[PDB]
Amino acid sequence: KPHVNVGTIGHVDHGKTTLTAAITTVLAKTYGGEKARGITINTSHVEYDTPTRHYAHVDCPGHADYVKNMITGAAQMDGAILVVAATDGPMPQTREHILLGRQVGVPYIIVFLNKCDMVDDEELLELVEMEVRELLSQYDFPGDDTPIVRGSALKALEGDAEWEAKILELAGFLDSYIPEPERAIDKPFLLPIEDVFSISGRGTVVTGRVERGIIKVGEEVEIVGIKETQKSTCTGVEMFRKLLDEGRAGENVGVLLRGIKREEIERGQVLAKPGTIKPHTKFESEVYILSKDEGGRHTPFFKGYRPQFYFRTTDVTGTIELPEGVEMVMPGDNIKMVVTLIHPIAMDDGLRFAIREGGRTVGAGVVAKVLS
Numbered sequence: 001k002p003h004v005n006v007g008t009i010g011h012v013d014h015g016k017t018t019l020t021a022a023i024t025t026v027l028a029k030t031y032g033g034e035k036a037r038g039i040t041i042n043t044s045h046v047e048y049d050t051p052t053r054h055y056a057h058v059d060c061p062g063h064a065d066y067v068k069n070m071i072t073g074a075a076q077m078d079g080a081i082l083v084v085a086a087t088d089g090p091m092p093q094t095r096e097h098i099l100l101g102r103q104v105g106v107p108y109i110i111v112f113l114n115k116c117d118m119v120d121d122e123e124l125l126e127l128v129e130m131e132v133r134e135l136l137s138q139y140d141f142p143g144d145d146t147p148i149v150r151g152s153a154l155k156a157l158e159g160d161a162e163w164e165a166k167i168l169e170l171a172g173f174l175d176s177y178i179p180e181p182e183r184a185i186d187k188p189f190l191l192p193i194e195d196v197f198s199i200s201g202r203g204t205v206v207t208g209r210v211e212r213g214i215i216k217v218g219e220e221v222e223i224v225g226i227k228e229t230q231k232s233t234c235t236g237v238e239m240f241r242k243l244l245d246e247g248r249a250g251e252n253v254g255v256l257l258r259g260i261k262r263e264e265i266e267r268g269q270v271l272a273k274p275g276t277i278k279p280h281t282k283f284e285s286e287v288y289i290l291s292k293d294e295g296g297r298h299t300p301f302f303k304g305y306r307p308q309f310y311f312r313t314t315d316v317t318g319t320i321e322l323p324e325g326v327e328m329v330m331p332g333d334n335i336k337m338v339v340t341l342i343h344p345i346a347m348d349d350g351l352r353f354a355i356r357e358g359g360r361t362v363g364a365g366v367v368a369k370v371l372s
């Protein structure tokens with residue numbers, strides 16, 4: 001079953017969490033036909049199945065105070081479900097999440113017009129959809145081709161068959177609108193670590209999505225980044241409600257390691273095939289500085305700018321060195337800069353990263369040359 005990562009986004013209380021619940025119970029009740037919790041160890045991470053696909057779903061909180069949290073997640077989404085209440089219509093955080101979505105590159109967005117159980121005016125609904133499409137278009141998303149499902153997450157969760165049908169329609173779009181993601185299975189194994197929980201009588205288990213390759217039980221691995229590189233052996237692989245012998249590219253899993261204590265592995269480090277990736281502190285890069293037009297800074301920054309650099313599952317402070325003669329960087333400029341991180345991160349040429357500072361996204365770049 002192909003694995004696809006999705007999630008819920010949208011304004012505070014528009015119905016993200018309820019919808020997540022409605023999706024799992026309607027799908028289990030309709031197509032329904034173990035202490036294993038890989039990524040589900042995280043409360044906002046669920047898993048469910050449609051007839052031909054398996055989904056990893058991250059339910060995001062809608063308050064601006066929590067924007068950080070969803071970034072590392074949205075960046076891993078193959079597609080996102082935008083929840084918008086028909087009552088309120090688009091709100092401030094509907095805008096921000098769409099914006100963040102565009103900045104990190106979420107490839108597809110499906111809309112669930114929620115709380116329609118509270119609205120009887122077909123004209124009201126048409127108007128709201130219309131403005132949701134324009135809002136999407138304003139952020140460079142296919143507003144006119146965007147599937148919009150009119151439903152009620154609450155009535156569906158409560159068992160109302162007429163509304164449950166809308167949940168299935170939504171699931172249908174997840175299956176049809178989001179293309180099957182390509183997986184780098186023929187590359188050396190790599191998995192960025194998100195959660196790290198200890199299981200009594202088993203050792204430590206790290207979770208995350210397998211970026212590329214395959215990790216099989218019995219194979220040895222390295223833990224690279226932040227701390228000094230360590231070595232270990234994969235004693236097991238799990239998923240929500242099942243045990244496996246392998247972890248494949250594109251799959252969200254939990255990996256058991258032997259001889260490693262919970263306090264020796266942390267978020268941000270990566271699990272990898274021995275000797276295939278190294279930790280670096282300094283590197284060169286081609287970075288694009290968002291314009292105000294795109295939600296970036298309104299002013300130029302100078303030498304010694306110390307923003308946060310987002311690499312895979314974590315972010316880390318870094319200092320910037322500018323090109324000889326260059327005194328400032330303007331919003332909207334493309335520039336080559338040498339970056340020095342406060343601590344090492346596993347990387348190689350080509351690795352993408354985002355730059356965030358002061359509550360917003362300032363840049364999007366890629367590692368050009370590793371130095372450290």
Ligand SMILES: CC/C=C/[C@@H](OC(N)=O)[C@@H](Cl)[C@H](O)CC(=O)[C@@H](O)[C@H](O)[C@H](C)/C(Cl)=C/C=C/C=C(C)/C=C/C=C/C(=O)O[C@@H]1C[C@@H](C(=O)O)CC[C@@H]1O
Nearest residue numbers: 075103104105140292293294295310311312352353354364
């Ligand atoms: C582990 C972290 C990984 C991160 C990476 O992810 C992954 N997955 O690795 C990132 Cl790094 C990706 O690799 C980046 C990527 O792929 C690139 O392609 C970027 O996507 C590309 C360079 C960007 Cl950044 C495009 C931004 C477009 C923005 C638009 C079109 C905004 C429209 C705004 C309209 C508006 O009206 O805004 C109002 C008014 C506005 C004002 O004008 O004032 C202010 C804001 C308001 O909302």
Ligand SMILES: Nc1nc2c(ncn2[C@@H]2O[C@H](COP(=O)(O)OP(=O)(O)NP(=O)(O)O)[C@@H](O)[C@H]2O)c(=O)[nH]1
Nearest residue numbers: 012013014015016017018061062063115152153154
């Ligand atoms: N009438 C109606 N109420 C709904 C519907 N979906 C959710 N609600 C209600 O609206 C409220 C918010 O629901 P919730 O799922 O927690 O919202 P959220 O978007 O996850 N909130 P947050 O941004 O904090 O994470 C709850 O009182 C819930 O019962 C719906 O389809 N119809």
Ligand SMILES: [Mg+2]
Nearest residue numbers: 016017060061
């Ligand atoms: Mg919620």
